[PDB]
A paper describes a structure:
DNA ligases are a structurally diverse class of enzymes which share a common catalytic core and seal breaks in the phosphodiester backbone of double-stranded DNA via an adenylated intermediate. The sealing of breaks in the phosphodiester backbone of double-stranded DNA is essential for the replication and survival of all organisms. This function is carried out by DNA ligases in a three-step reaction in which the enzyme first self-adenylates, followed by DNA binding and transfer of AMP to the 5′-phosphate terminus of the DNA nick, which is then activated for nucleophilic attack by the apposing 3′-OH group. ATP-dependent DNA ligases (abbreviated ADLs) share a common catalytic core which includes all six of the conserved nucleotidyltransferase motifs and comprises the adenylation domain (AD domain), where the AMP cofactor is covalently bound, and an oligonucleotide-binding domain (OB domain), which engages the minor groove of the DNA duplex upon nick binding and assists in the step 1 adenylation reaction. Here, we report the biochemical and structural characterization of a bacterial ADL present in the partially sequenced genome of the psychrotolerant Psychromonas sp. strain SP041 isolated from Svalbard, Norway. This protein, hereafter referred to as Psy-Lig, is a minimal type of bacterial ADL possessing only the catalytic domains necessary for self-adenylation and nick-sealing and an N-terminal periplasmic localization sequence.
The 1.65 Å resolution structure of the enzyme–adenylate complex presented here represents only the second structure of a bacterial ADL to date and is the only available structure of the minimal type of bacterial ADL. Each Psy-Lig monomer has a large (172-residue) N-terminal AD domain comprising two four-stranded β-sheets surrounded by five α-helices and a smaller (77-residue) OB domain comprising a five-stranded β-barrel and a single α-helix. The two domains are connected by an eight-residue linker, and in both Psy-Lig chains these adopted the open conformation typical of the enzyme–adenylate intermediate, in which the DNA-binding surfaces of the two domains face away from each other. AMP bound in the active site was clear in the observed electron density, covalently linked to Lys25 via a phosphoamide bond to the side-chain Nζ atom, which is consistent with exposure of the protein to high levels of ATP during purification. As in other ligase–adenylate structures, the AMP is in the anti conformation, with the adenine nucleotide base stacked between the hydrophobic side chains of Phe97 in motif IIIa and Met155 in motif IV. Nine sulfate molecules were also resolved in the electron density, one of which is located in the active site of chain A. A sulfate ion at the equivalent position in ChlV-Lig–AMP occupies the binding site of the nicked 5′ DNA in ChlV-Lig–DNA, a structure which is also likely to be the case here.
Author numbering: 0 to 257
The structure:
Amino acid sequence: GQPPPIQLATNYRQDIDVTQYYVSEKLDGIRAYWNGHQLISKQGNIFTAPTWFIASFPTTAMDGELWIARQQFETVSGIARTQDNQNEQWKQIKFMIFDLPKSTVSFEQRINKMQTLVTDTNSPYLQMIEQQKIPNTVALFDLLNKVVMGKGEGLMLHHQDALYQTKRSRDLMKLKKFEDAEATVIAYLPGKGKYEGLLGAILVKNEEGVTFKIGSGFSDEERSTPPPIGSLITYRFTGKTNNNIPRFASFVRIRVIY
Ligand SMILES: *P(=O)(O)OC[C@H]1O[C@@H](n2cnc3c(N)ncnc32)[C@H](O)[C@@H]1O
């Protein structure tokens, strides 16, 4: 089937006015688009949602996450992949909504409509993701910590004045504590001081063609036995610094030896 006409998120940017954004918990589920009569996956597959699961839903199109609870991704994914419209396991799933993709008004009014839709439907299977205002970035990062320590995935931000767009949107942003990506180890940088005779850092070249140093994230065993040159490794970072270098980059682990 054709992929559904959905809005996609960009990455958090430091220089926003956080007071203009609604903040919600980023849920680790399976995205579904409700077109008014069926649920559709990001790839265009029609989910075999049982009749009793969707029976109460309004015909307003809705965007949401099929989700059970924090840290139950494989469970919800396993159910949603099952081709069986009489599968009782859907009873533990909630369609957690976060937008109205056919709406032509601002996100603030869309939230108000969603609250009404959820309340009127009054079904265990349809619920609204909480949307809150946060006063400043320090408070936002404190909230991020609360959510992550509680085994949540992160936060999402959506500008109160945003109009729905069927593409990546700068008005919709993901905020996680960090990002991971891959790079190839190309050289060693011998250490000094406590790391004399050991690994000080590696030089890697990432998939965007940027070469940079990684000196943190190594165990003491890894400073004695470094990743092989040529290996594909995963590094962790958040945002970019000058010259498109991943910021606060640290070593995670080896993926492939070349
Ligand atoms: P991650 O990088 O896995 O991105 C999360 C995706 O799921 C959708 N999503 C989850 N939770 C929400 C909220 N609260 N609001 C909006 N969208 C959500 C996002 O589109 C991401 O694609």
